[PDB]
Structure 1
Amino acid sequence: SDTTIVTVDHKDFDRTEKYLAEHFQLQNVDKADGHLMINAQKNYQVILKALSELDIYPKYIETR
């Protein structure tokens, strides 16, 4: 029942928030620290590619 946390630059948070809300199952957000928690992605390729197309590159990505 694990979860995937994406961490981005503050300047990328709003667009990352918008994209993940529209394209994945967005659960929690912690804007102060730049974290967004979505349903676990076993393979990161699709999310990393889509964010790259927005010129967004995560500071971090991890699965609890």
Structure 2
Amino acid sequence: GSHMSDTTIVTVDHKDFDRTEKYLAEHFQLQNVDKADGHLMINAQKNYQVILKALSELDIYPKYIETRKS
């Protein structure tokens, strides 16, 4: 069976948060949403290219992206 022990955390500028949340809601599963600090958590991704390219199409560039144990 599965071992879903890791999360990917995307951090964006406040002005980009709502549109980043919309993108991740439509294409991934949001586990946590912290608008106050600019963080969005999804299931752990091994390859960031899909997300980075789609955010770039929205003119959004994360301040940070990290995968770690939840």
Q: TM class, shorter-chain normalised?
A: over 0.9
Segments of 5+ residues of structure 1 without an aligned counterpart are none
Partner of 1:2: 6
Segments of 5+ residues of structure 2 without an aligned counterpart are none
Report how far residue 25 of structure 1 moved.
1.2
* Runs of 4+ that moved beyond 6 A: none
Give TM-score, length-normalised by structure 2: 0.89
Q: Distance in 2 between matches of 1:41 and 1:47?
A: 9
Partner of 1:40: 44
2:23 to 11, 14, 19: 19
Q: Secondary structure at the match of 1:20?
A: helix
Q: Secondary structure at the match of 2:62?
A: coil
Q: Please identify the structure whose Cα radius of gyration is greater.
A: 2
The two structures, once aligned, show a CA RMSD in angstroms of 0.5
Q: Distance in 2 between matches of 1:40 and 1:47?
A: 12
Q: Deviations over 1:4-28 (max 9, x none)?
A: 0000000000000011001111110
Give TM-score, length-normalised by structure 1: 0.97
Instruction: Count the aligned residue pairs.
Output: 64
